[PDB]
Design a protein around this ligand. Structure first.
Ligand code: HEM
Ligand code: HEM
Ligand SMILES: CNCCN(C)c1cc(C#N)cc(CCc2cc(C)cc(N)n2)c1
Ligand SMILES: CNCCN(C)c1cc(C#N)cc(CCc2cc(C)cc(N)n2)c1
Ligand SMILES: C[C@H](O)[C@H](O)[C@H]1CNc2nc(N)[nH]c(=O)c2N1
Ligand SMILES: C[C@H](O)[C@H](O)[C@H]1CNc2nc(N)[nH]c(=O)c2N1
Ligand SMILES: [Zn+2]
Lengths: 407, 411
């Protein structure tokens, strides 16, 4: 019932008690581990509210106080009467920070308490959503000195009035299939890119076209908006040693901003809750640049390095991979845009885990996602046992809206 | 019930039904995933169902399920259990058993090869000297002058738990580790405790950076005895780099034969506590783990120095750079000396083809993603993108506690 995790590099053993407060299910059973699978009413609501308000009043050292009891009372009355309830600003902020704190797949969580929360619960239209999002983008970007932020649109009601950002990230590049059979730009967004086209976006049909926002307010049909280009900070990618690198014509955007997730707080569902921080270098250089189903540039780079691409055992892919990742880091650093390398981020995460074990009794962590996609075992997270479990408040996956929405 | 796995690079979706045959626990529950946790005497009572389940599997595999031969064998094993409280495997069942434990080994990327395993039956062995002889023969056979052949040697099964056969070494071939009075380590830090035991038992330590350890062998619950493997039988590869001529002067070598000797083989409820097995290396085991773990040889610094990389900030990715070169060097050295080795790209591609074949022919392939994905360049290998299901099938290889922690000393 009380569980131990060991670091095999340092022998440090930590004891996890926080898991016993776990709520949602993992996908695993005693017979089958699903650790590597990517996606495994009035009655129901008050226990959820109570569990949340209990953790909130505990956090501000007011558990069992009149104000605690009075709020539980007030929320109970409001659910009984309205079928839902509204969070106080203080609860909203606490909830959103804790959803990040509880994100088991996030290596960046040492930062969890410095999150700027933008309350957009007064928003009613897609133009309003566009405005909130431009403001979030500019605040977070901060001329390259990135600051973590979340913007929270109105919560789900009857479920026919959902607010949604259809984009998977606030800032992403277009993808287009051609007669050629291949793909121009980002192949991950081909479908979304065409949804934008079929909605009326005039695509410049290039390799790095910032997609328009497709915003859905109050369950209405989503609408298109171009983010002011002056708000989209982008970085040209060069290498500190290879002068030819720049001629590949690679660039990426400074702001990583997930916009398709659902934020659950005290049983309330916030279906539009875009959040952003700053990149770990490997996200762009390993995943975005080198995944076979992404920009897939390994082959071209290896060629310019004149490596032996004859046999896999020359490790030409591995060599190119490192160089590409050195370039990403160097470019962001040169242009004074916040970025973290995988060594620095994973070391910070170990220190964070230790804080959380010490101060909270644990830290839910998903090893499959935490260990970087390159140089795994030379980062300390590789040797760290982690327990994965689901706490609330949380960020959850939700279905893509084009399958759900009724036009 | 059916379970699907998706490859996120190819969108290929596979369907697992084999998990229905899973028995042992994972350590996970609906409330906690223990997927990254490293380590998560029988009665007649529990033994006959385990025997029956095994023999049903064996007999189906030979297309003789429900045959007279099948039935007579069940009855013979049954009678043997109630009479002697255990039973003996026929040679054919032992071979099938050992091949299947490998096939079922979810942490093993090399399983495409599972059906080519040379099984050496050492169940007539009675003494530590007898074990030494069997292990020498296994090493010579598996080494095959560099043309490595997979093998397992299987000593007598557990009886009352008081007469266990054990190989105390964790691998048949491994280098000594010595902790110095100043706190530094000479040789392999992983093997310090084991090296000290060997020393206490009377091994004369050369005290260098690459001293091949003696074998410490326990037969029939007796105190273990030391033996030196003939050096002519220990194939080693000096490590050099195809382009960096200073790489050789780092003084590195490694042995060619990876041979796990501390696991327990379970077949039909029987426990084979000494079952050393061997294959050939994937380059990263040596180049990433053995050489570059901080708690192992830890050569990243000295290598990066000699490459004149910028070591002042981690964001230069100097460690990543030194890491790749070292791994190039390991593969180059092995290939140049004609010693079997596989790179992590080749090995993972073959694993995916194996895994797909297994889904089609067997209904599944249990796989531990945490172990299967290589410890460098994870996402540029196809396994990173492959969803896997981890579950436990028998026959199986299992961990067991280190014998110095449990052995009753005779004197
Ligand atoms: C401060 C800089 C941050 C860094 C360096 C960071 C790091 C990362 C990395 C490397 C991943 C894996 C992403 C992938 O492979 O797709 C990740 C996932 C995640 N992060 Fe963080 N993060 C940061 C800020 C945040 C913030 C501010 C939040 C929420 C407010 C957050 C919540 C999550 C969630 C929910 C996931 C999983 C998303 C999914 O499952 O696709 N991150 N983060
Ligand atoms: C044929 C060449 C082979 C290759 C390239 C191969 C590859 C590997 C690798 C890379 C690991 C992870 C090792 C570690 O990190 O400690 C492993 C684990 C394993 N392999 Fe294979 N293997 C091969 C043959 C075999 C054979 C012949 C058996 C038994 C018959 C076997 C059974 C296992 C077991 C039981 C584990 C888990 C070890 C543990 O949990 O510590 N392997 N193998
Ligand atoms: C799905 N994961 C692999 C591809 N990568 C690297 C990836 C894809 C998408 C999308 N859509 C989004 C991300 C961003 C994840 C993230 C979020 C935040 C707040 C910060 C950060 N550094 N990364 C990363
Ligand atoms: C414990 N895992 C990391 C250290 N490594 C790489 C490691 C430690 C020990 C031991 N003892 C043994 C091995 C060899 C595992 C193995 C076995 C076989 C049959 C083939 C193969 N390629 N590797 C590897
Ligand atoms: C199948 C496997 O779970 C999938 O490839 C995962 C592995 N680990 C990951 N880790 C991170 N951080 N991000 C990812 O997208 C993935 N993809
Ligand atoms: C804590 C974590 O499970 C541990 O470091 C694992 C990770 N993956 C591994 N994978 C392999 N092949 N071998 C290992 O020793 C490990 N170690
Ligand atoms: Zn699990």
């Amino acid at each position: 019932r009380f569980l131990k995790v060991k670091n095999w590099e340092t022998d440090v053993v930590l004891t996890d008690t926080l898991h016993l407060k776990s709520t949602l299910e993992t996908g695993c059973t005693e017979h089958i581990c699903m650790g590597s699978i990517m996606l495994p009413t009035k009655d129901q609501l008050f226990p959820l509210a109570k569990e949340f308000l209990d953790q909130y009043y505990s956090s501000i050292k007011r558990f069992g106080s009149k104000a605690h009891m009075d709020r539980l009372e007030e929320v109970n009355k409001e659910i009984e009467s309205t079928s839902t309830y509204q969070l106080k600003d203080t609860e909203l902020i606490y909830g959103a920070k804790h959803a990040w704190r509880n994100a088991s797949r996030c290596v960046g969580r040492i930062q969890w308490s410095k999150l700027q929360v933008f309350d957009a619960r007064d928003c009613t239209t897609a133009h309003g959503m566009f405005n909130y999002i431009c403001n979030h983008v500019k605040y977070a970007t901060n001329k390259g000195n990135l600051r973590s932020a979340i913007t929270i649109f109105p919560q789900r009601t009857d479920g026919k009035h959902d607010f949604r950002v259809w984009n998977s990230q606030l800032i992403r590049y277009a993808g287009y299939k051609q007669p050629d059979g291949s793909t121009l730009g980002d192949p991950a967004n081909v479908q979304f890119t065409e949804i934008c086209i079929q909605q009326g976006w005039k695509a410049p049909r290039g390799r790095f076209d910032v997609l328009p926002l497709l915003l859905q307010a109050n369950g209405n049909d989503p609408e298109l908006f171009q983010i002011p280009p002056e708000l989209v900070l982008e970085v040209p990618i060069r290498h500190p040693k290879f002068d030819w690198f720049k001629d590949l014509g690679l660039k990426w955007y400074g702001l990583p901003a997930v916009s398709n997730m659902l934020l659950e707080i005290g049983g309330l569902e916030f279906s539009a809750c875009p959040f952003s921080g700053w990149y770990m270098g490997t996200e762009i250089g390993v995943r975005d640049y080198c995944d076979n189903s992404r920009y897939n540039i390994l082959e071209e780079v290896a060629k310019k390095m004149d490596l032996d691409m004859r046999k896999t055992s020359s490790l030409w892919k591995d060599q190119a991979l490192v160089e590409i990742n050195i370039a990403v880091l160097y470019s962001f650093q040169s242009d004074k845009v916040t970025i973290v390398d995988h060594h620095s981020a994973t070391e910070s995460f170990i220190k964070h885990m230790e804080n959380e074990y010490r101060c909270r009794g644990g830290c839910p962590a998903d090893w499959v996602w935490i260990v970087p996609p390159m140089s795994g075992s030379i980062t300390p997270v590789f040797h760290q046992e982690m327990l994965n479990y689901r706490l609330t408040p949380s960020f959850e996956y939700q279905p893509d809206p084009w399958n759900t929405h009724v036009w």
